[PDB]
Amino acid sequence: PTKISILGRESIIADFGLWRNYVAKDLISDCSSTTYVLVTDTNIGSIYTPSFEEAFRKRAAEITPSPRLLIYNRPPGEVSKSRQTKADIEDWMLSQNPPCGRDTVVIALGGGVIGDLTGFVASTYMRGVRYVQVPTTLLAMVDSSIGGKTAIDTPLGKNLIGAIWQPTKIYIDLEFLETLPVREFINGMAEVIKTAAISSEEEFTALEENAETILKAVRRRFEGTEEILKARILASARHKAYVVSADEREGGLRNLLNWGHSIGHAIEAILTPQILHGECVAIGMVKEAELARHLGILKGVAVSRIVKCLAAYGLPTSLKDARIRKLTAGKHCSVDQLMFNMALDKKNDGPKKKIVLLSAIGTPYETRASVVANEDIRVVL
Amino acid sequence: NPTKISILGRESIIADFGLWRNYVAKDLISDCSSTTYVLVTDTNIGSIYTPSFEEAFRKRAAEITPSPRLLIYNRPPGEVSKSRQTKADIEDWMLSQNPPCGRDTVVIALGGGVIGDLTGFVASTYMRGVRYVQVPTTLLAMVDSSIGGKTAIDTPLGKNLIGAIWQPTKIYIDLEFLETLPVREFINGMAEVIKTAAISSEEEFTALEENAETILKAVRRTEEILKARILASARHKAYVVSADEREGGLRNLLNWGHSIGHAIEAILTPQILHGECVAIGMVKEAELARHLGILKGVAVSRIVKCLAAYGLPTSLKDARIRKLTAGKHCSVDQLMFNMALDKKNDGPKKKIVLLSAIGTPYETRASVVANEDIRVVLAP
Ligand SMILES: NC(=O)c1ccc[n+]([C@@H]2O[C@H](COP(=O)([O-])OP(=O)(O)OC[C@H]3O[C@@H](n4cnc5c(N)ncnc54)[C@H](O)[C@@H]3O)[C@@H](O)[C@H]2O)c1
Ligand SMILES: NC(=O)c1ccc[n+]([C@@H]2O[C@H](COP(=O)([O-])OP(=O)(O)OC[C@H]3O[C@@H](n4cnc5c(N)ncnc54)[C@H](O)[C@@H]3O)[C@@H](O)[C@H]2O)c1
Ligand SMILES: O=C(O)[C@]1(O)C[C@H](CP(=O)(O)O)[C@@H](O)[C@H](O)C1
Ligand SMILES: O=C(O)[C@]1(O)C[C@H](CP(=O)(O)O)[C@@H](O)[C@H](O)C1
Ligand SMILES: [Cl-]
Ligand SMILES: [Zn+2]
Ligand SMILES: [Zn+2]
Structure with missing residues (x-):
C-alpha cells in the first residue's frame, strides 16, 4: 500500500x-x-x-x-x-x-x-x-x-x-x-481541477488531455483508465497534504485550497441541496477567475482554459446551465443575495472579503487569499 | 504589576x-x-x-x-x-x-x-x-x-x-x-479548593482546616489568607494541565470526588450545585478507598469534617439537600448507570481516583474499580 x-x-x-x-x-x-x-x-x-x-x-x-x-x-x-x-x-x-x-x-x-x-x-x-x-x-x-x-x-x-x-x-x-454514480464522479473532478490550477500548469495540462478518456470510462469500470485515474487522484491528495502540513489552521497558505469557494459557497448556500458542492465550486472557479481577470491579475487566455476544462469534464460553468435549471425549481441567486452570503465566508478578515486570485494557471497571486473590494466582486456576480 | x-x-x-x-x-x-x-x-x-x-x-x-x-x-x-x-x-x-x-x-x-x-x-x-x-x-x-x-x-x-x-x-x-458573590456560591467553590489540596498537599489541607472559621465569618459579614488559598489551587491546576493537558493520566486527579459526584449531579441538578455534589462525591470516594483498604478511617473523618466546617453537605441525607430536592432521590442503580457515562472509564472499566492519604493519591491517575465494590458506598 x-x-x-x-x-x-x-x-x-x-x-x-x-x-x-x-x-x-x-x-x-x-x-x-x-x-x-x-x-x-x-x-x-x-x-x-x-x-x-x-x-x-x-x-x-x-x-x-x-x-x-x-x-x-x-x-x-x-x-x-x-x-x-x-x-x-x-x-x-x-x-x-x-x-x-x-x-x-x-x-x-x-x-x-x-x-x-x-x-x-x-x-x-x-x-x-x-x-x-x-x-x-x-x-x-x-x-x-x-x-x-x-x-x-x-x-x-x-x-x-x-x-x-x-x-x-x-x-x-x-x-x-x-x-459511484456518474454525476458524483463529475462533482469530485471540480476539486481535482481546482487543486491542479493552484499548484501546477503541467498537472492542469494532464487533466485537459485526459478529459475525453476519463469521461468515456465514467459514462460507459476503469480497467482501461486505471493508471491515469490513480495519478490524477494521488496528485490531488499529495498537494493537499503538503499545504495542510505547512498551514494546518489556515493562517495563510491553506486559504489556497478555497479557490472557487468564496463565490462557490455563496452560491451553494442557496442551491443546496439540489446542486452539489463540486458543481457550485465549478461556477465559483469561473467567477473568481473572471474577477482576477477584471483586476488585471489573470489573463483572458487562462480564464478560457479554466472554463473549457471544467466543461470538458461535464461540470457547469454558469448559474444558468440548463441541467442546473431543471433541478432548482426557479431558485434565485441574485447579486445582493450572493454578497450577503459572502459576508459569512470564513476567510474574511473582519469585514474585508478575502478571495483567492490566480495570476496564471498553476500559480496563485499571493500565498493567501487577497482582500477584494465589494464593488469589484459585484462585477462578476 | x-x-x-x-x-x-x-x-x-x-x-x-x-x-x-x-x-x-x-x-x-x-x-x-x-x-x-x-x-x-x-x-x-x-x-x-x-x-x-x-x-x-x-x-x-x-x-x-x-x-x-x-x-x-x-x-x-x-x-x-x-x-x-x-x-x-x-x-x-x-x-x-x-x-x-x-x-x-x-x-x-x-x-x-x-x-x-x-x-x-x-x-x-x-x-x-x-x-x-x-x-x-x-x-x-x-x-x-x-x-x-x-x-x-x-x-x-x-x-x-x-x-x-x-x-x-x-x-x-x-x-x-x-x-x-452570594454566600452559597462561595461555599460551593470551596469544594474545588478542598479537593485540590486533598489530592496534593497536606500542608494546604491543614491551612484550609485552620482558616475555615475566619473565612466563613468574612463571607457572612483575611485577604492575604484568601488570596493564598486561591493562588495555591490555581498553581496546582496549572502544573497538572501543563503536564497532561489532554488527560492521559495525571489530569485524572483533578476529578477526585467527581466519578460519584457527577453521577449525583446528573440526578440533582439544577437544584444542587456542582461543588455541593462533588462534596458528597469526595466523601463517598474516600469511603471507597477505605473499603479497598487503601485509605485509613481517620483520613475519611478528616475529610468529612473539613467539608462540614466550610458548610458543604457530606451526605445525600443532608437536610438542606432534602429540602431543595423534595421529590427527587438517588438510587444505587441510577447512580451506577450514570457512572457508566464517566469520561475517565476505560471501555466498561470504571476508573475512580483513590487517595492513600490526605495529600497523596494511590497512583497519579484514576484506578479501575470493580462495579461490585463501587456499589457498596452508594446508599444515602
Ligand atoms: N472537509 C473538507 O476538507 C471538505 C472538502 C471538500 C468538500 N467538503 C464537503 O464535502 C461534502 C460533499 O461530499 P460528497 O460529494 O462526497 O457527498 P456525499 O458524502 O453525500 O456522497 C455523494 C453521494 O454518493 C453516494 N455514495 C457515496 N459513496 C458511494 C459509492 N462508493 N458508491 C455509490 N454511491 C456512493 C452517497 O450516498 C451520496 O448520495 C460537502 O458537504 C462539502 O462541504 C468537505
Ligand atoms: N471546565 C472546568 O474545568 C470546570 C471545573 C469545575 C467546575 N466546572 C463547571 O462549572 C459550573 C459551575 O460554575 P459556577 O459554580 O461558577 O456557576 P455559575 O457560573 O452559574 O455562577 C454561580 C452563580 O453566581 C452568579 N454570579 C457569578 N459571579 C457572580 C458575582 N461576582 N456576583 C454575583 N453573582 C455572581 C451567577 O449568575 C450564578 O447565579 C458547572 O457547570 C461545572 O460543571 C467546570
Ligand atoms: O482547506 C480545505 O481543506 C478546504 O479549503 C476546505 C473547504 C471547506 P471550508 O471553506 O468550510 O473550510 C473545502 O470545501 C475545500 O475543497 C478544501
Ligand atoms: O481536569 C479538570 O480540569 C477537571 O477535572 C474537569 C472537571 C470536569 P470533567 O469531569 O467534565 O472533565 C471539573 O469539574 C473538575 O473540577 C476539574
Ligand atoms: Cl457542537
Ligand atoms: Zn470544496
Ligand atoms: Zn469539579
Missing part, C-alpha cells in the same frame, strides 16, 4: 482492496479499542458494511474481551450536515450499553458529507475521540478526507460550525469508485 | 484586585487585537459589571483604526444554559451580526463556570475556532474552571458529555468580583 505523510503522521494509506483486506486488522492493531462505531449513509451501508462486519469478527477473533462494532446509518446528502443529526448520533452513542466512551474509534465510511459530520462528532465526543476516514467518493479521496476540517451547516451557510480534528488513519480505496 | 502565572508555556494567567476596572480592556486591545469582541455573561452579572467595561473598552480602543466593536450577549443563569440549544442560540446571534462575527473574533467569558464552559465551547467550534479569554467571577471559576481549557455542555443523560479542549488566550483573575 502507498503511504502519504501529513502533519508528521503516516496516516494516509492507499491501495485497491484496502476495505476488503486491510482496514479491520489495521484498526485492531493500530487503533486498539473495545468499541468501534461505524458511521455511514443509507445509500451505501447495505452495499459495503456486510463484508466489513465479517472482516471485523475475524480480526477480533483472538482479542479478549471481545470488542464490539456498532453501526449508524444516516440519511444521505447535505441535509445530514446539521446540528440535529450531530446530536442524534451523539445521543445514540451515549445510549449504547455500555455507553461509547473515550476509547471509541469512529469510522467515517462515506463521502465528504459523512466524513465532515462524523469527524465533527468525534472532535467533541467527551471532548474528543479517535476517528478514521474511509472515503467512498472521488471528492472525498482527492479532498475532503484529508486535512482534518470537519463541520456542519446552519440555515445561514456552509460549514459555519465545526473543528479541525485529524483522523488517525485515512484509507483510500479506489475500488469504491466502481459503484 | 499584577501577578502572572504560567500555563502550557505562556503567562496567560493574570491576577490582581481591580483588573476588570483597570487592566483588561487595554490588555485585550494590545494582546488580543481584533475588529470584534463578543462578551458573553448571564443576566445576574451583566447589569452589574458590563456598563463599566463598555466605557473602559471605548477608552482603550480610542487610537485604534478602524474602531473595534464590543457586542454583548446575556444568557439565563445556571446549569440550564450549558445546553445544545443555548450554544446554538449564541452561535446564531454571532453569525447574524452586521457584519457577521468572523475568525478574528475575540470572545470574552464573563462569569462563573457555566458561562466559562459554554462560552469556551462556543469559541472552540465557531468557524472552527476563535480566540477567547476567561474572566472568572465566582470562587469556583477562579480556583478551577477558568483554567485548563476544558469546555462543555450537558445533555439530558449527564454532565459535560459533549465539549472540547480549547485554551483561552488570557485568564484574568480579579478578586474584586467576590464582593458580590
Whole structure:
C-alpha cells in the first residue's frame, strides 16, 4: 500500500482492496479499542458494511474481551450536515450499553458529507475521540478526507460550525469508485481541477488531455483508465497534504485550497441541496477567475482554459446551465443575495472579503487569499 | 504589576484586585487585537459589571483604526444554559451580526463556570475556532474552571458529555468580583479548593482546616489568607494541565470526588450545585478507598469534617439537600448507570481516583474499580 505523510503522521494509506483486506486488522492493531462505531449513509451501508462486519469478527477473533462494532446509518446528502443529526448520533452513542466512551474509534465510511459530520462528532465526543476516514467518493479521496476540517451547516451557510480534528488513519480505496454514480464522479473532478490550477500548469495540462478518456470510462469500470485515474487522484491528495502540513489552521497558505469557494459557497448556500458542492465550486472557479481577470491579475487566455476544462469534464460553468435549471425549481441567486452570503465566508478578515486570485494557471497571486473590494466582486456576480 | 502565572508555556494567567476596572480592556486591545469582541455573561452579572467595561473598552480602543466593536450577549443563569440549544442560540446571534462575527473574533467569558464552559465551547467550534479569554467571577471559576481549557455542555443523560479542549488566550483573575458573590456560591467553590489540596498537599489541607472559621465569618459579614488559598489551587491546576493537558493520566486527579459526584449531579441538578455534589462525591470516594483498604478511617473523618466546617453537605441525607430536592432521590442503580457515562472509564472499566492519604493519591491517575465494590458506598 502507498503511504502519504501529513502533519508528521503516516496516516494516509492507499491501495485497491484496502476495505476488503486491510482496514479491520489495521484498526485492531493500530487503533486498539473495545468499541468501534461505524458511521455511514443509507445509500451505501447495505452495499459495503456486510463484508466489513465479517472482516471485523475475524480480526477480533483472538482479542479478549471481545470488542464490539456498532453501526449508524444516516440519511444521505447535505441535509445530514446539521446540528440535529450531530446530536442524534451523539445521543445514540451515549445510549449504547455500555455507553461509547473515550476509547471509541469512529469510522467515517462515506463521502465528504459523512466524513465532515462524523469527524465533527468525534472532535467533541467527551471532548474528543479517535476517528478514521474511509472515503467512498472521488471528492472525498482527492479532498475532503484529508486535512482534518470537519463541520456542519446552519440555515445561514456552509460549514459555519465545526473543528479541525485529524483522523488517525485515512484509507483510500479506489475500488469504491466502481459503484459511484456518474454525476458524483463529475462533482469530485471540480476539486481535482481546482487543486491542479493552484499548484501546477503541467498537472492542469494532464487533466485537459485526459478529459475525453476519463469521461468515456465514467459514462460507459476503469480497467482501461486505471493508471491515469490513480495519478490524477494521488496528485490531488499529495498537494493537499503538503499545504495542510505547512498551514494546518489556515493562517495563510491553506486559504489556497478555497479557490472557487468564496463565490462557490455563496452560491451553494442557496442551491443546496439540489446542486452539489463540486458543481457550485465549478461556477465559483469561473467567477473568481473572471474577477482576477477584471483586476488585471489573470489573463483572458487562462480564464478560457479554466472554463473549457471544467466543461470538458461535464461540470457547469454558469448559474444558468440548463441541467442546473431543471433541478432548482426557479431558485434565485441574485447579486445582493450572493454578497450577503459572502459576508459569512470564513476567510474574511473582519469585514474585508478575502478571495483567492490566480495570476496564471498553476500559480496563485499571493500565498493567501487577497482582500477584494465589494464593488469589484459585484462585477462578476 | 499584577501577578502572572504560567500555563502550557505562556503567562496567560493574570491576577490582581481591580483588573476588570483597570487592566483588561487595554490588555485585550494590545494582546488580543481584533475588529470584534463578543462578551458573553448571564443576566445576574451583566447589569452589574458590563456598563463599566463598555466605557473602559471605548477608552482603550480610542487610537485604534478602524474602531473595534464590543457586542454583548446575556444568557439565563445556571446549569440550564450549558445546553445544545443555548450554544446554538449564541452561535446564531454571532453569525447574524452586521457584519457577521468572523475568525478574528475575540470572545470574552464573563462569569462563573457555566458561562466559562459554554462560552469556551462556543469559541472552540465557531468557524472552527476563535480566540477567547476567561474572566472568572465566582470562587469556583477562579480556583478551577477558568483554567485548563476544558469546555462543555450537558445533555439530558449527564454532565459535560459533549465539549472540547480549547485554551483561552488570557485568564484574568480579579478578586474584586467576590464582593458580590452570594454566600452559597462561595461555599460551593470551596469544594474545588478542598479537593485540590486533598489530592496534593497536606500542608494546604491543614491551612484550609485552620482558616475555615475566619473565612466563613468574612463571607457572612483575611485577604492575604484568601488570596493564598486561591493562588495555591490555581498553581496546582496549572502544573497538572501543563503536564497532561489532554488527560492521559495525571489530569485524572483533578476529578477526585467527581466519578460519584457527577453521577449525583446528573440526578440533582439544577437544584444542587456542582461543588455541593462533588462534596458528597469526595466523601463517598474516600469511603471507597477505605473499603479497598487503601485509605485509613481517620483520613475519611478528616475529610468529612473539613467539608462540614466550610458548610458543604457530606451526605445525600443532608437536610438542606432534602429540602431543595423534595421529590427527587438517588438510587444505587441510577447512580451506577450514570457512572457508566464517566469520561475517565476505560471501555466498561470504571476508573475512580483513590487517595492513600490526605495529600497523596494511590497512583497519579484514576484506578479501575470493580462495579461490585463501587456499589457498596452508594446508599444515602
Ligand atoms: N472537509 C473538507 O476538507 C471538505 C472538502 C471538500 C468538500 N467538503 C464537503 O464535502 C461534502 C460533499 O461530499 P460528497 O460529494 O462526497 O457527498 P456525499 O458524502 O453525500 O456522497 C455523494 C453521494 O454518493 C453516494 N455514495 C457515496 N459513496 C458511494 C459509492 N462508493 N458508491 C455509490 N454511491 C456512493 C452517497 O450516498 C451520496 O448520495 C460537502 O458537504 C462539502 O462541504 C468537505
Ligand atoms: N471546565 C472546568 O474545568 C470546570 C471545573 C469545575 C467546575 N466546572 C463547571 O462549572 C459550573 C459551575 O460554575 P459556577 O459554580 O461558577 O456557576 P455559575 O457560573 O452559574 O455562577 C454561580 C452563580 O453566581 C452568579 N454570579 C457569578 N459571579 C457572580 C458575582 N461576582 N456576583 C454575583 N453573582 C455572581 C451567577 O449568575 C450564578 O447565579 C458547572 O457547570 C461545572 O460543571 C467546570
Ligand atoms: O482547506 C480545505 O481543506 C478546504 O479549503 C476546505 C473547504 C471547506 P471550508 O471553506 O468550510 O473550510 C473545502 O470545501 C475545500 O475543497 C478544501
Ligand atoms: O481536569 C479538570 O480540569 C477537571 O477535572 C474537569 C472537571 C470536569 P470533567 O469531569 O467534565 O472533565 C471539573 O469539574 C473538575 O473540577 C476539574
Ligand atoms: Cl457542537
Ligand atoms: Zn470544496
Ligand atoms: Zn469539579
